[PDB]
C-alpha cells in the first residue's frame with residue numbers, strides 16, 4: 415500500500431497503487447465512490463463529486479484520464495482541453511481525497527486487444543457517425559471499475575446515452591456496483607455546462623441558450639402530445655441564429671428497442687460554428 | 703438474509719444473486735473462493751481442475767455448470783450437447799465440492815445478447831478460424847462468472863490452451879483481480895487427451911486418434927534438434943495415421959504469438975476423424 419494521507423488530496427498514477435489503496439480502504443469499512451472524468455473540470459463535474467461526497471463514510475476517487483479509445487481521430491484527441499493544475503486545485507477545494515491520473519501506457523500496455531462491444535444502442539444517436547465511440551467509453555469504464563472497485567460510480571445525465579450504456583454494461587456483465595445518475599448542471603440561463611462551452615464566442619454563447627429553451631419548452635408543451643412537444647422545440651431551434659440542428663429525437667427513457675410510451679427523453683445535438691453541443695431532458699407525454 | 707450454506711456438503715444454487723451472496727459471505731469468514739467453470743458432462747479432466755482448486759488452503763470450491771449458448775456456432779449443436787445433471791452433482795459430491803452454480807440461460811442472459819466482450823486478434827486464429835465467434839462467447843460468459851462469483855482463483859485446463867491464453871488476456875486487459883490457474887491435460891492411458899468427444903470415435907478412429915498425442919510428444923523430444931525437426935517429427939506421426947484430417951499443426955510461443963526458433967513454446971494440433979474434431983497441444987522447449 416502506497417502512502418495515503420486522510421483528509422488530503424492523494425494523487426496516484428499507477429493503477430496498482432490506487433487499487434491497493436482502494437482495497438485497503440474498503441477492507442477497513444470506508445465506502446469507495448468513483449467519479450470518472452477526462453479532466454478540464456467545471457461545476458457539472460463537481461456536482462458528481464459532491465453527490466459522491468455526501469454518501470456516509472465514503473472516500474471519493476476521481477479519475478482524470480483523457481481516454482484515447484473514445485476519440486475517433488488523432489485531431490480530436492489532441493484538441494481536448496487539458497487543465498491539470500486547475501483540476502487538482504478544484505478537487506482539493508472539494509475535499510476529494512483521491513485523484514487517479516493514469517498514463518495511456520499504463521491503461522493500454524497492449525494497445526487495443528480485448529475490448530467491450532456495446533449493444534445496438536451504441537450505433538445510434540451520438541454513436542451513429544462515431545461507431546467506435548461507445549466501445550471506447552465502456553472499455554475504459556469497465557477497466558476503471560475493476561481497478562478502483564467502487565461501491566458506487568457517478569455519471570451525469572448530461573451524457574444521458576452514455577449513462578444508459580453504462581447501466582447496460584453493469585447489468586450485462588453482472589458488475590457489483592451501483593450506478594448513480596446525477597442531474598445536469600446548467601448555467602443561469604439554462605445552458606448545460608460542458609467543457610466545450612469555452613469554444614463558443616459571445617454571439618454563439620448567446621445563441622446556445624436555444625437548446626435548453628427548446629427542450630424545456632418541449633417538456634411543457636408535452637401535455638398536448640409528442641408532436642406538440644417536438645414542434646415547440648423545433649420552433650425554438652429554428653428561431654436561433656447560427657444553430658444547426660444535428661438531431662432532435664424523443665425516445666423511451668431507456669433509449670432501447672421500445673416505443674416512447676408516456677415517460678421519455680428528448681435529446682438534441684446542434685452545431686454552433688465548429689462546436690457541437692448536446693442537451694436532453696426528461697419528458698412526460700400527456701402529463702401536466 | 704444470506705441464502706443458506708451447509709459446510710461439508712454440496713450446496714446447489716441456480717440464481718446468480720444467491721451464489722454471489724454466499725460467495726461474498728464465505729470470503730468474509732476466511733475462505734478463499736475458487737472457481738471452476740464447466741459446461742457439465744463432467745469427466746476426469748474436469749475433476750483435475752476441481753482437485754487443483756480443492757488443495758488451496760481455506761478453499762471453498764465453486765463449480766459452475768452452464769452450457770453457454772453464446773459460444774455455440776450458428777452451426778454448433780446446442781441441444782445436442784451432453785446434459786447429465788444428476789451424475790454431475792454426484793461427481794461433485796464425491797469430490798467434496800461445496801458449491802455448484804447451475805444458472806438457467808434466462809438468468810445469465812436476461813436481456814439477451816447486448817453488451818459483450820470482443821476478444822483481441824488471437825480469437826480469429828486456430829480454433830477461431832472455423833468458429834470466428836466462439837471465443838467472444840467464452841470470454842463473455844467467463845467475465846460474467848467472474849463478476850458473479852468473484853473468486854480469488856479461477857481454473858482452466860491446458861486442454862483448451864487457446865481458451866486459457868485468451869482468458870489470461872481478458873484478465874490482464876480488463877484489470878481483473880483474480881489469479882488464472884492453468885491445469886495440465888488429463889489423458890487416457892495411451893495419451894489421448896480426455897474429452898467427451900472421444901466416445902464418438904469408432905475403433906479405427908479411436909486407434910488412429912492416438913497419433914495426435916504421439917505426434918506432440920515426439921515433437922517435444924525432437925525439439926532438442928530445433929523447431930523444424932519438432933514440426934517434421936509431428937507431421938510424420940500424423941502422416942502415419944489413416945483418416946486423420948489435420949486442420950492445423952502450429953508451433954507458437956507460449957502466449958500464442960509467433961513461433962520461436964529458440965526457447966519455450968507450445969505446439970498445437972487439431973484434426974477431424976470423420977465428423978469428430980479433436981484437439982491437443984503440448985509445451986515445447988526449442989533447442
Ligand SMILES: CC(C)(CO)[C@@H](O)C(=O)OP(=O)(O)OC[C@H]1O[C@@H](n2cnc3c(N)ncnc32)[C@H](O)[C@@H]1O
Nearest residue numbers: 450451452453458481569570572573597598599607
Ligand atoms: C466516462 C468517461 C470519463 C470515460 O472516459 C468519459 O466518457 C466522460 O464522460 O468524461 P467527462 O466529459 O469529463 O464527463 C465526465 C462526467 O461528468 C458528467 N458531466 C459533464 N457535464 C455535466 C453537467 N453539466 N452536469 C452534470 N454532469 C455532467 C458527464 O455526464 C460524465 O459522467
Ligand SMILES: CC(C)(CO)[C@@H](O)C(=O)OP(=O)(O)OC[C@H]1O[C@@H](n2cnc3c(N)ncnc32)[C@H](O)[C@@H]1O
Nearest residue numbers: 739740741742747770858859861862886887888896
Ligand atoms: C470455460 C467455459 C465453461 C465457458 O462456457 C467453456 O468454454 C468450457 O471450456 O467448458 P468445458 O468443456 O466443460 O471444460 C471445462 C474446463 O475443464 C477443462 N478440461 C476439459 N477436458 C480436460 C482435460 N482432459 N484435461 C484438463 N482439463 C480439461 C477445460 O479446458 C475447461 O477449463
Ligand SMILES: [Mn+2]
Nearest residue numbers: 497499500501
Ligand atoms: Mn487554467
